């Protein structure tokens, strides 16, 4: 398809790598070195105390937080011999999840989805993984992630993570990331219930805006989930040299989990689509009531106004001098017409 | 025969720009025979014809250079899309200019046809005005390596000028989208819906134009014809990357405007309800009142309210009574 070259963009010097993003507040480097017996971890600010982990024997977890420090990213990639296009993809957050297989490392792009209750905003953050022979390299934007359970598992020798190699560490990271989508998709559920209750009770424009934010958020979730499932499928049915044969069933289980992730997001999508039509039915019902009011008023008071005008015209010849001058008779005629209209409306159950 | 489809026939001229490492020599003439014999010049020759509506000259020029009459059909075929065709003795490219107006948001387009031949490049334009003044400056004043390279580098420079103008057009579209974002979300206005429709239409036109240009540039560098030469492939590849960078922004802008339209059209039913509420409120509190006026405005004798306890103030107080009960009836149940 291509030869994996730099993008040579406009209005930007040729050798420039640019952080595409919004977060420029936090920078930290958390290293987590572990083995079957030993274990150590340390936060860091300078990168040079982290490079000597490229050549090692224990499985190491290097967590670079804050990719607006393009200098740190380039230094790490140069030490680990990572292709500059890969660093450019690391620094570009406007992309879907990916999986690229190289002769010495795998490069996985994933996305975390923090969801806030107020303002109903779906926030996204790119997290990038590079699996080298003994090191897993992680790049993030902000502080905060979903990998605390893994950290506890290393810290307390829980699970089986410390017996196995960096392939199992990569699996654990991807598994935790995928499992957080279940938290997301069960958070959305009660919000859907609240929307349903509100549309049953109070129809307004804010409900419309909320429902359409739900629709856009679910479309974005689908656009993120599908490439994620394809990435896991590629990690599974390709058997790269870096991932051993005993790690494949775990990736199979992650793919399985992604299945019902997508299934339940589809169910949420069409149930909120139903809430939309419930809304339209309710608002049309209210408009029907008010239009019934208006048409009842008009139906009664157009003909009576017409009759008042007719008997109120000024011609030289008038029917006044008959039927006991007919003024109470005329009023009784108007009353009879109004009563007939009212009972006809009530006959058709017209509110 | 040859027929011109466009709507620009007001002017016509021919501009020539020959150059070499030694010197440059330019013409601005009107005769086809004068510009005819530059084909065999060893130095690069740039030929510009500002009027293609004059089918006579555009028919005459292609006969000498040896271009198949299908490209003659396409050059005067204004209603087209960007495309590139390779031939044995030449290559034929069709591109689009774009003129935008801030005061009147209409996206005007002019078609440009490029014929790269051996040591000669032919340009065909509809109206006056182009995007190649910087290339003229480089040619006149030795501002780059454009003088040291052959006609393929000229084709590069002209396509690069076109994509630069596309970048400027993107800047203007960005300004318009920035204004319309607030003008739509913050306030509703009658002009804003039409403005959003026009913005969507212009972005559709841009999208329909840009992707063929991307395919054209990919054809230019990826599969190399003998004309382009190997040294010029990196340059056309850079232009292809610029086209990618334009297309991505076009998609993003289209998504933004589509979201604006979706919100506006989702906010319609309750607006209908509110207008109906206003009309029903107005009609309910006035039609019976007009009836009350008319019923005592009848030409009936022996009516009881001749002067019965100040009949006119009594009627007016009655009007006030029904008005008050009607207005409080709505507020209790909240219409």
């Amino acid at each position, epitope marked *: 398809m291509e030869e994996k070259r730099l993008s040579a*963009k406009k209005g930007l010097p040729p050798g*420039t790598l640019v952080y595409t993003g*919004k977060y420029r507040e936090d920078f930290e480097i958390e290293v987590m070195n572990y083995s079957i017996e030993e274990f150590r971890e340390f936060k860091t600010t300078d990168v040079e105390s982290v490079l000597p982990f490229r050549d090692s024997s224990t499985p190491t977890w290097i967590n670079i937080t804050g990719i607006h420090r*393009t200098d740190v990213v380039q230094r790490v990639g140069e030490f680990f011999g990572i292709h500059p296009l890969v660093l450019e993809d690391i620094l570009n957050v406007h992309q879907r999840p990916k999986v690229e297989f190289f002769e010495n490392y795998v490069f996985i792009v994933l996305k975390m989805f923090t969801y806030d209750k107020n303002l109903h905003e779906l926030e996204s953050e790119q997290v990038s993984l590079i699996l080298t022979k003994n090191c897993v390299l992680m790049f993030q934007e902000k502080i905060g992630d979903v990998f605390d359970p893994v950290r506890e598992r290393i810290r307390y020798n829980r699970g089986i993570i410390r017996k196995k190699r960096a392939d199992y560490l990569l699996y654990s990271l991807i598994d935790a990331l995928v499992d957080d989508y279940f938290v997301l998709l069960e958070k959305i559920d009660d919000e859907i219930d609240v929307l349903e209750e509100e549309v049953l009770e109070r129809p307004e424009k804010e409900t419309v805006q909320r429902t359409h934010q739900l629709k856009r958020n679910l479309v974005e979730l689908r656009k993120t989930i599908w490439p994620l499932r394809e990435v896991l499928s590629s990690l599974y049915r390709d058997v790269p040299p870096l991932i051993e044969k005993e790690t494949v069933p775990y990736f199979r289980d992650v793919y399985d989990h992604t299945i019902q992730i997508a299934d339940t997001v589809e169910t949420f999508r069409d149930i909120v689509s139903g809430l939309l039509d419930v809304y339209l039915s309710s608002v049309s019902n209210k408009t029907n009531e008010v239009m019934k009011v208006l048409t009842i008023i008009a139906t009664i008071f157009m003909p009576l106004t017409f009759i008042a005008g007719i008997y109120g015209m000024n011609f030289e010849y008038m029917p006044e001098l008959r039927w006991k001058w007919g003024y109470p008779v005329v009023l009784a005629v108007m009353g009879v017409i109004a009563v007939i209209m009212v009972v006809y409306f009530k006959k058709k159950k017209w509110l | 025969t040859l027929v011109y489809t466009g709507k620009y026939r007001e002017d016509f001229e021919i501009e020539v720009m020959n150059y070499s490492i030694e010197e440059f020599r330019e013409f601005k003439t009107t005769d086809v025979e004068s510009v005819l014999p530059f084909r065999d010049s060893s130095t690069p020759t740039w030929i510009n014809i500002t009027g293609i509506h004059r089918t006579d000259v555009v028919q005459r020029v292609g006969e000498f250079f040896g271009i198949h009459p299908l490209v003659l059909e396409d050059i005067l075929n204004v209603h087209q899309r960007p495309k590139v065709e390779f031939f044995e003795n030449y290559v034929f490219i069709v591109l689009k200019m774009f003129t935008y107006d801030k005061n009147l948001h209409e996206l005007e387009s002019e078609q440009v046809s490029l014929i790269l031949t051996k040591n000669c490049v032919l340009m065909f334009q509809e109206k006056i005005g182009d995007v190649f003044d910087p290339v003229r400056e480089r040619i006149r004043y030795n501002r780059g390596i454009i003088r040291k390279k052959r006609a393929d580098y000229l084709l590069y420079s002209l396509i690069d000028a076109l994509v630069d103008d596309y970048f*400027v057009l993107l800047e203007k579209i960005d300004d318009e989208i920035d*204004v319309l974002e607030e003008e739509v979300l913050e306030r509703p206005e009658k002009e804003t819906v039409q403005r959003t429709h026009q913005l969507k239409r212009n972005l559709v036109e841009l999208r329909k134009t840009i992707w063929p240009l991307r395919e054209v540039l990919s054809s230019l560098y990826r599969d190399v014809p003998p004309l382009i030469e190997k040294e010029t492939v990196p340059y056309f590849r850079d232009v292809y990357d610029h086209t990618i960078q334009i297309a991505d922004t076009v998609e993003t802008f289209r998504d933004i405007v589509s979201g604006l339209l979706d919100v506006y059209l989702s906010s319609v039913s309750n607006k209908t309800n509110e207008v109906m509420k206003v009309l029903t409120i107005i009609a309910t509190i006035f039609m019976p009142l007009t009836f009350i006026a008319g019923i005592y405005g009848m030409n009936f004798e022996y009516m009881p309210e001749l002067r019965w306890k100040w009949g006119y103030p009594v009627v007016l107080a009655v009007m006030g009574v029904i008005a008050v009960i009607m207005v409080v009836y709505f507020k209790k149940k909240k219409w």
Partner: antibody
Amino acid sequence: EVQLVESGGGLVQPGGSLRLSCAASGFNVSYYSIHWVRQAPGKGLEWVASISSSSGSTSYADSVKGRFTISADTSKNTAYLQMNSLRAEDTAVYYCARSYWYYIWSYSYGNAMDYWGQGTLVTVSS
Amino acid sequence: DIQMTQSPSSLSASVGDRVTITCRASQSVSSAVAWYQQKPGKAPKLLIYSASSLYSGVPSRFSGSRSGTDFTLTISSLQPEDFATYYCQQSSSSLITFGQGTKVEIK
């Protein structure tokens, strides 16, 4: 920790020359762009030149173009401004700044200046 | 090139009231506008970039926004540390220019 230090500023005869040395510590000048901004006494800031050390890209203002010269030294982690054909209207305080690129749209990029040096005063008179 | 016309040329205000400084562009500067604060004898400090993004460490009192071609800097609760000169700077092209400045003093 990240700092920029300027030197070379002084009193120079008109039509003269001097070189300004921008000593950068705490970062590598290869990964960032370096700018030169001056400020005449009592007048506002004005941007002079820029250098992208890794790629060699240089840009100049018209008031100094073809008359100034910006350069970089990767080994010494410093950037220079050369001032030739000096006029008396080039007298100012010369700042060295460091900028990063950020993303707005695909076609659009902007850069902002984080850190500055305390500046050097250049006088061109007598 | 591009001219940044920054108005007003100077301003006097108290502590607590909203201060708004406006900058207009000659032609389209697609959100590439940054705001700086300079105090006499000191190097300028960065406040806003991308016309709406708060630089790290800057107080939340400072705010920026764009409406097409014109840009505004807003200080919601002016404080004694805010009395300085404010500049608008564009970086849409490689030849980047500043505004003329705006001096905010005590009413």
